[model samples]
Target chain A: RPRREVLFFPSQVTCTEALLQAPGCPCSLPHSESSLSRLLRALLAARSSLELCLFAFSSPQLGRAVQLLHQRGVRVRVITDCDYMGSQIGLLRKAGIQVRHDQDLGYMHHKFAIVDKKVLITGSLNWTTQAIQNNRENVLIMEDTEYVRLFLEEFERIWEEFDPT
Target chain B: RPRREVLFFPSQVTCTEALLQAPGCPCSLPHSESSLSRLLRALLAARSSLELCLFAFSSPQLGRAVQLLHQRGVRVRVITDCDYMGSQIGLLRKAGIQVRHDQDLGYMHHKFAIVDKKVLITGSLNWTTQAIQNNRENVLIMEDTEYVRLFLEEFERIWEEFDPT
Candidate 1:
């Protein structure tokens, strides 16, 4: 068991500006567009593999990223809590990504991904239109190898525990 | 409209461990315990006030922390997505902490809390029991002033948007 610790160093951190979707607005707002662009860029930058364990996921561009990565030969896998899984999951399964669902009495709550064994993206941002465009959310992107390793370990453990097919 | 951007920095970062509760476990696991402790410590460390914008919140211990803060005269205000609010929120409200709920069609999906206008605790981890004890969740705690400022701004925006009485 790892004990909690604190560390501090000067770091440049950036976040998405807060914006809301008007009733029946047709375009992406500043916050949603900014948040989506970062996620898309990270998904596109994967060199070898990408792993995600999400509670809820449903964004067309994010789904397309998974498809594009799979098409580009990047190993992509996903494990989600079946109950909260978004409706668009069929797109990933149809794209040939190994999508597994975890049936737990409680929630399999995670919104994170490991990219290229080097970068980690985790925060409150789910992959849904509500999360990106309507709801207030934050996504932290870190290229730290140590943080990536921890997320990788958790991803591996959950992937195994769920017995993904 | 501010476009999203990424900044690179050399910083030392620490994290809570990932521990899971197997079926039928009644006690807290390492990861959840570790995660909960940090949140408690942050709340206890708040000198002036604590503000939280959470999607779901229902932890007895965390609630007690808020009560303690309010008891000691710390200004405490909370905004939650009523759908995900815990049964324990009444504890805070009764303790004189002003609590509000969102009225939007979309989920008020945020899990970050600003402590004393200086520290921020955010990420996928909600304030629910499942988030810490049962779900594969992550909580990021940072003391960087810039990050805290951004979260505070969003908190102010949401606080005004939702007129919860």
Candidate 2:
């Protein structure tokens, strides 16, 4: 992880590997059942471990994903608001994704994550409905380890300070 | 303009509507389009002047709605953040909505609005997709002058304080 560049691919929502990143044309078409379904499927496929820091993570569509990951032995560690613990954390725990709450500190104030040191997803997305439909949000998929290392450094620092008890 | 209570129906993103106003459900189905949409369209149609503030405002569908308003002739005044603004704001502005960045000061933190003093819409949807699709988002439509008065006061206050230029 050495050199780094932040490429701006403006005017896009759903980013995938197949299509060329283009502005004005969202790669993952909004409201498409297939796309939404696919996002859920891919997230759950992670086999090793998953670390998350989001503003609000309360979607059960994601719950099914974590359930599958847990069944497959994926160590899912999610850090979210304490108020949402009963709803989001409880469901994931039921699904077997190790859950943690960070309510003591104001807001985690982040909407991003790392997957097995390979995938990096960040943007204005939350696990809430506002993040998905009524408002506009973008997600950047960073695969370059060099940059992810930076994101990781912050992740580690935040995770430690979070005290998810 | 004084104050009064108002009732509202559903709209594009229901899930988000519910989650934000928890204990209530904005995340599930059986959503009805907001009566405010008609008002939004009408006000935008007037194109005199329009201003809005949303907490989680990030939805493609809602963006389309705003786009339509801008297309009609209204000079759209918006307050959003760098958090999700990177993707959503560009798209909204491109669609013809005259957007003003408002995150630098204190997180484009208000989530509601004033539309030509004729209508007002507010709620928990931070203007994001998750609010509509996965998470719950809430919207309260107000056409009463008093209602608009209060919201208008806040809008002007935040508008003056917001500086993302």
Candidate 3:
């Protein structure tokens, strides 16, 4: 069965409310209706591998989701722009997730991820606070094999190109 | 019948070569194989109505396509970020295209276009020269009605919000 979902943000998510309540509140996990929660649910659903190619990744919620996947022994590989190798990237690196940065002069401006080589999440929504909480953004989540294969190919191509040799 | 195409840039297109050849070279129209050409083709295919919600618009080729659509009497409406009301926005206005800018403090950062209310072209690719010729970007051309309806709804909401009152 093919699955497709279109999500728009800045969306209303209970996670924001939960964050205000406490540091690691479980209340946020109950509702998966909000766009942000849907996104997190998709990421956390990855059982084996998570491949990310984004220009920026600084959203704490998203970062924590990635870290959780990493801790679960899921192979989490990230390819991000060299310019945006900031705090979140540092945290991912600290979590022992192998992260690589593009060596090109032009910005590595892709904002997509492939989970378990099956689902493809692509759009204008960078995994950043500004994108998730402030700027208007769109995300396409698809379970179509054709799209997934293309994105996986792109990820591997960039992953190889950004090899830290 | 549903149609889907995934495009990635900076892609190789004969238009870039034609631009180097002459000011208004006809050779560029021969091929529609490149990702950029595919995008231009999608925009040029718009007949009745074209609704665009983009954060930036500065690509000469894309701007010319919008002008052509307007010339064909297509109802072309654009909603763009106020911060990027630059040369291209001015050119669109000059072409008699109805362009509106967001009034919000958060950026109006959507990058999607609804063509004929049947096809939706969206992703991380902004309509800009740098994005086209340099940055690594992704575009998803979808003919799914459910997805198209959602984007159309978002466009209409923003369109009303950015009313020039």
Candidate 4:
């Protein structure tokens, strides 16, 4: 049986401050603490691969986590909406991460990630400062094979469809 | 034990067209057919109550479903972002559905609904035409007590905090 964890944000504590803390930050916080910390820990813990399908990605902490994963030789692929490729994405691209954009007219409004082809992290939370610190957002993290498989397939389908050139 | 069903969209069939169909549309479609249809059915199946906490709610089909629920005496309450109360929300207000707006500086960007306080429907899908027919979205329907309870608590907290007066 797979375990599920749910995080609701606009967390009671200051997620930004918590994010700035040391090794005892997100990864070390008890599971019962800040939802944002839990989410960051989940992303930072990706061992093999990370697939991000998102509409927006401007959170510095989340971007740093992805960069950290890349530095560790973890395969990180991003599929994001064309309109939202801002400085953070530029940083990701400069870091040599393979990123693709949805060329379709409609926005690619998915907010999900797959970690290691086994865990699914998804919900209405865009990886943005506003979403983390202010908006009411919810995230569901599941270590379910079936759920991860479906999202992985969706990622691959879009990754191929979103031809960079 | 609770059963969970996940729906990923940009569904194969035209969700907007299917939305316009008769009783055979969403509610009566085989459970395996369209994810959009399944979602519509879930919204339309609310018996006693429906709580919607959303950032956007512009889908006519979804509005009509909520209206129908109201007409049948299923209490429907909405909590939406202050900036997104468009004409559709106007229609909901005209139909006597009580709606409150988040007063905070941050967005009220949740997209989840509780049906009869027993079923939880949530994820990246906002109740919008673009989200339904074009955006790559995912929804999770869970007949789980714990998930529903958590979301319901979130809804009530927002509802009260979003003082209508």
DockQ for each model: 0.37, 0.02, 0.69, 0.66
Q: What is the DockQ ranking, best to worst?
A: 3, 4, 1, 2
Least accurate 10 contiguous residues by lDDT in model 2 chain A: A2-11
Tens digits of per-residue lDDT for model 1 on A27-131?
343333344665677778888999988887886667777777888899998988773343567878866788877774446777888888877877777787656
* lDDT of candidate 3 over B1-165, digit per residue (tens): 688888988877455444222333345354436888788889888889999998888888888788878888999999988634448789889778889887646478888999999999998888888888777888889999999999999999988987888
Which sequence of candidate numbers ranks them by TM-score, best first? 3, 4, 1, 2
| Best-performing candidate as measured by DockQ | 3
Q: What is candidate 2's lDDT per residue for B32-141, written digit by digit as tens?
A: 54433433344344446678665545565566556666766766777765535446667776766655654454344445556667766554345555444333223434
* Lowest summed lDDT window (length 10), candidate 1 chain B: B2-11
Better of 2 and 4 by lDDT: 4
Evaluated on chain B only, candidate 3 has a TM-score of: 0.87
- Whose TM-score is greatest here? 3
* DockQ, cand. 2: 0.02
Off by over 4 Å in 2: A1-35, A83-86, A104-106, B1-165
Error of 2 at B14 (Å): 43
CA displacement after TM-score superposition, residue A84 of candidate 3 (Å):
5.1
TM-score of chain A of each: 0.75, 0.69, 0.87, 0.85
Task: Work out the TM-score per prediction.
Answer: 0.74, 0.43, 0.89, 0.85
Candidate 3 wrong stretches, greater than 4 Å: A16-32, A83-86, A103-106, B16-32, B83-86, B103-106
